[PDB]
Amino acid sequence: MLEQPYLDLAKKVLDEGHFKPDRTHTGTYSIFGHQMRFDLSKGFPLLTTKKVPFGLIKSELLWFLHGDTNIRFLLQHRNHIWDEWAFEKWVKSDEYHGPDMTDFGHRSQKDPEFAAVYHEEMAKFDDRVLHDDAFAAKYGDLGLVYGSQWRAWHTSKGDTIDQLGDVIEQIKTHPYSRELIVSAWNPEDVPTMALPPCHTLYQFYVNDGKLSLQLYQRSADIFLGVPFNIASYALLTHLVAHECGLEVGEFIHTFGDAHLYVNHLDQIKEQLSRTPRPAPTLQLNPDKHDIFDFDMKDIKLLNYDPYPAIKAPVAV
Amino acid sequence: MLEQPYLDLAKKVLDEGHFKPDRTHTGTYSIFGHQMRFDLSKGFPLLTTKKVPFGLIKSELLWFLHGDTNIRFLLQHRNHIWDEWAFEKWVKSDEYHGPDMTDFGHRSQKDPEFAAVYHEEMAKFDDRVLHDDAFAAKYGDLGLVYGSQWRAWHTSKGDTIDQLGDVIEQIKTHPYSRELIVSAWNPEDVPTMALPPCHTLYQFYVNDGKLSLQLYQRSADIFLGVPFNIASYALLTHLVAHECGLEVGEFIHTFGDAHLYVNHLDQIKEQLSRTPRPAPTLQLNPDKHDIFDFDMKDIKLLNYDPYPAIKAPVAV
Ligand SMILES: O=c1ccn([C@H]2C[C@H](O)[C@@H](COP(=O)(O)O)O2)c(=O)[nH]1
Ligand SMILES: O=c1ccn([C@H]2C[C@H](O)[C@@H](COP(=O)(O)O)O2)c(=O)[nH]1
């Protein structure tokens, strides 16, 4: 089936993954170096063996494509994936005059009441961002995140490069370019960031009228991260192919440190006892083509009939 | 055998590589996305099925490690690999008062006499670089090349980052870092360069006291390039492991566009009729450890008994 490579990756990390300590000490089973390919002409690689919220993938990718760095956009579509990076700033700011939220994460994971008070501050924070523009401009702007790395890479010359916008023209004018690459990795920014870009780099490749994309993921959470990661990029492959008037080829996923945190073992095992159902199909707006102006309604997933969602601790 | 993955890659590009036009129009048989791993604990991956000049690999890697960008260093060890990038500048300069060398390459490849006059200017140019410091400082300095990308990445702040020097300390202090990455890809420089870095990015990974390295090669010449490429990086894996006092693990080679130019078909076929002999061993200076101060004599290849060298047109 289409998602087999993912399942096979899990199987593998279980059989020959070696214990490797990580920054959160939640333990991992790792492997270094791996590659999975997906023939997009055969279906959209959204996992059928567990329900994956395609809506969170759409909004987030679009946010990236708009070159947006402000969380406000996400919260407008109830996407909270990035809420904590922003929340962190608010919490550690002199303007923050409230309860002690010393890295809320670990404490909310244990203290039942902390989770509640912490959850107030988050709901509150999100509210300010959504309604108060002066607040949003300040705390809702992550800054160095995919949207700006892809579309507004800063230069010493003082200006900014739209890596992705130039790359799409490259495919239109020079489809056989061996340089259709977009890097999210900037050495000078890398050491100050709370989380250096996991999805480090990607390359396009056109042959026979089909567009392919290879992604270099430096680090991956097999259970919780990879399912989304596969969907974001296969979707982008479709969007670019759409913009460029090309057929969709393969999405090649290359990993560095692929790992399974120890608290996801039961869940991934159960996941593996399930049988993949036929894959969904992606349909895109035929008329609208400037993918940078795209929006939710312009992209639709057909026939996604998954298995129930598997709950797991974000002890990640 | 150790080099089997390379041979298997050639086999593959021959069986399912599709014709894809390239910048030189010498035709290629391409594939997109591929990964080979090499267990360095089993031997040094220098091809035994054809003689590969290990000396050119040593000097070049060392040149990179010194953060050097001047060809003079290479010419001192009779390494001419980069001679043409420098030569180009001299040829297209107002100080150049001599014969018309309109992209010598293609014309020298055909015109027998051009090859001679062109060869005079190259021998001459190299001479000036080696003896004349004012000349060398000007025309012998490539500028944006691996040594400076690895060791002197320029920042908007005006200064310069030693990516590699910081990364080795990272392995010493935080061996389990999932961020031990060195990028050679700078978006703002990429469009002005005659040849954007082929070896785009690499990542280290430490587990069980063994050091591994994964390389992302955006484009590869199966016949002429890859043999060297495999040696440069597996060697670097050893050098860093040496500096850090770690065991050598695996060298993982990830490709984007792996290709065979059409004029290398007979040669690669003949290559494939040969049987790999046992692999060589690499021995490094035990006392000397600051790999940045290393030199030729500090590195030695033992037992490299290859097959004769296979000649091929650099119609690359
Ligand atoms: O889209 C994402 C975002 C994050 N991660 C994971 C990778 C690691 O599991 C952890 C980050 O750890 P570092 O690689 O930064 O050390 O989050 C993913 O798998 N996918
Ligand atoms: O160490 C090297 C240097 C160059 N090349 C090859 C890659 C391509 O065959 C050609 C460069 O073409 P572009 O990728 O820049 O388009 O040179 C290698 O394989 N190895």
Swiss-Prot record, chains A, B:
Its annotated pathway reads:
Pyrimidine metabolism; dTTP biosynthesis
Gene encoding it?
thyA
Q: Does the keyword Cytoplasm apply?
A: yes
Protein known as: Thymidylate synthase
Where does the source fall among the domains of life?
Bacteria
Residues recorded as binding dUMP, renumbered to this chain, are: 23, 178-179, 218-221, 229, 259-261
Query: Per its record, what are the GO molecular function terms?
Result: thymidylate synthase activity
Q: Look up the record and give one Gene Ontology term from the biological process aspect.
A: dTTP biosynthetic process
Lineage, top ranks: Bacteria, Bacillati, Bacillota, Bacilli, Lactobacillales
Q: Which CDD domains match?
A: TS_Pyrimidine_HMase
Q: Where is the active site?
A: 198 (nucleophile)
InterPro entries linked to this entry: Thymidate_synth/dCMP_Mease, Thymidate_synth/dCMP_Mease_dom, Thymidate_synth/dCMP_Mease_sf, Thymidylate_synthase, Thymidylate_synthase_AS
The record's section on Pfam families has: Thymidylat_synt
Binding of (6R)-5,10-methylene-5,6,7,8-tetrahydrofolate: at which residues? 221, 315
Q: Where in the cell is it found?
A: Cytoplasm
Its UniProt entry gives the catalysed reaction(s) as: dUMP + (6R)-5,10-methylene-5,6,7,8-tetrahydrofolate = 7,8-dihydrofolate + dTMP
Ordered alphabetically, the record's keywords are: Cytoplasm, Methyltransferase, Nucleotide biosynthesis, Transferase
Stored PANTHER family: THYMIDYLATE SYNTHASE, THYMIDYLATE SYNTHASE 1
Q: Hey, which family's this protein in?
A: Belongs to the thymidylate synthase family. Bacterial-type ThyA subfamily.
Q: What does the protein in this record do?
A: Catalyzes the reductive methylation of 2'-deoxyuridine-5'-monophosphate (dUMP) to 2'-deoxythymidine-5'-monophosphate (dTMP) while utilizing 5,10-methylenetetrahydrofolate (mTHF) as the methyl donor and reductant in the reaction, yielding dihydrofolate (DHF) as a by-product. This enzymatic reaction provides an intracellular de novo source of dTMP, an essential precursor for DNA biosynthesis.
A GO cellular component entry from the record: cytosol
Provide the E.C. number(s) assigned to this enzyme. Answer: 2.1.1.45
Keyword Nucleus attached: no
Subunit structure of this entry?
Homodimer.
Species this protein is from: Lacticaseibacillus casei (Lactobacillus casei)
